[PDB]
Amino acid sequence: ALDDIDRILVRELAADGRATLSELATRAGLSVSAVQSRVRRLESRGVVQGYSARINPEAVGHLLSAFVAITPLDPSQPDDAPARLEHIEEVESCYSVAGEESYVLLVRVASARALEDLLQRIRTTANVRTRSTIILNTFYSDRQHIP
Amino acid sequence: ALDDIDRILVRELAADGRATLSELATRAGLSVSAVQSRVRRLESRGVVQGYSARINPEAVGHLLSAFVAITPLDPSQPDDAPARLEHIEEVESCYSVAGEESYVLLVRVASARALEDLLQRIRTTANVRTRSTIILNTFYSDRQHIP
Ligand SMILES: N[C@@H](Cc1ccccc1)C(=O)O
Asked: Distance (Å, rounded) from C-alpha B7 to C-alpha B28?
């Protein structure tokens, strides 16, 4: 239940999250009221989860990023790694994954030594072994596709 | 230098990219003309890179996400895989990495069947071998942290 109009709306809003209701109304052939109300239904049905500025991580002092794959030191202990790691602010994302590892994290940090301290924090807070893959360059990211 | 009132602004806009320049000014303690001019300057030094609505991928038909680690088949050839894959819309992100593979992609697709098709297209269009790690669930993503 996403009609043609809604796909247009989410496509425009993925490319430009600050687009005004009136720019959107003219692209969709709707009134500004019609647009607001379709946008409110997109948000409350959880199709649109929120809006963010895309911040350049380097510009704010995050000069090093990494994938960290984690696996429980004790797989019989309950499985709450994501909730435990939620209070660690340098953890930007957490996915559960098929394979030998349990979770993959994306982590951002100021430097190599800051990474070594963060890995210790991640091993003790989730009781986990870590396998780190350092990112050397981001060619493009977050390019959301609406088919 | 990021004039740490500037840190309040990026912090606020990362959390709510549809914040208004006036509902901002009160939260930061400035005047619409200052707020507006910083934001335009932040956008000009590529600190804020865009604004986007965060779309739920499964709401839109992408019921299968995967990391796809790729490595060029022939190292005598120019390594231009990111440029070559850029036109493939199901690739959301591309990173070079220090690990076992040369690059990691984040890919989104309708089904396991559609992934197999996509992996064939990736192999033939960029001349790479692939290795996919299927995501089961996303616990949180894109929590941009501003120190
Ligand atoms: N990696 C496990 C799935 C899993 C993820 C996270 C926690 C526990 C299990 C598998 O391939 O079956």
From this structure: 10
Tell whether ligand 1 has an atom less than 6 A from the beta carbon of residue A99. Answer: yes
Number of Cβ atoms within 10 Å of the Cβ of B114: 17
**Ligand 1 atom with least separation from CA of A101:** 1
DSSP H helices, B16-111, are 21-28, 32-44, 81-85
User: Cβ of B60 and A136 within 8 Å?
Assistant: no
Q: How far is the CA of A101 from the centre of ligand 1 (A)?
A: 7
Q: What is the resolution of this structure in A?
A: 2.2
Pick the CATH number of A3-54 from 1.20.1300.10, 3.30.200.20, 3.40.50.2300, 1.10.10.10: 1.10.10.10
Tell whether B87 lies on the interface with A, counting CB pairs under 8 A. no
Contact with chain A for residue B44, Cβ under 8 A? no
- Cα A2 to middle of ligand 1, angstroms: 32
Handedness of CA A24, A28, A33, A34 (dihedral sign): negative
Q: Closest Cα of chain A to B21: distance in Å? A: 11
Q: Are strands B48-55 and A103-109 parallel, antiparallel or unpaired?
A: unpaired
For ligand 1, atom 6: residue with the closest CA: A102
Method: X-ray
The CATH architecture assigned to A55-135 reads 2-Layer Sandwich (3.30)
* CA Rg value for chain A: 20
Distance (Å, whole) CA A4 – CA A139: 31
CA atoms in the 13 A half-sphere facing the CB of A30: 20
Hey, CA dihedral for B143, A129, A115, A104, is it positive or negative? negative
Q: Where are the domains of chain B?
A: 3-54, 55-135
Are B50 and A14 in contact by the 8 Å Cβ rule? The answer is no
Q: Where are the beta strands (DSSP E) in A4-147?
A: 48-55, 64-72, 91-97, 103-109, 128-140
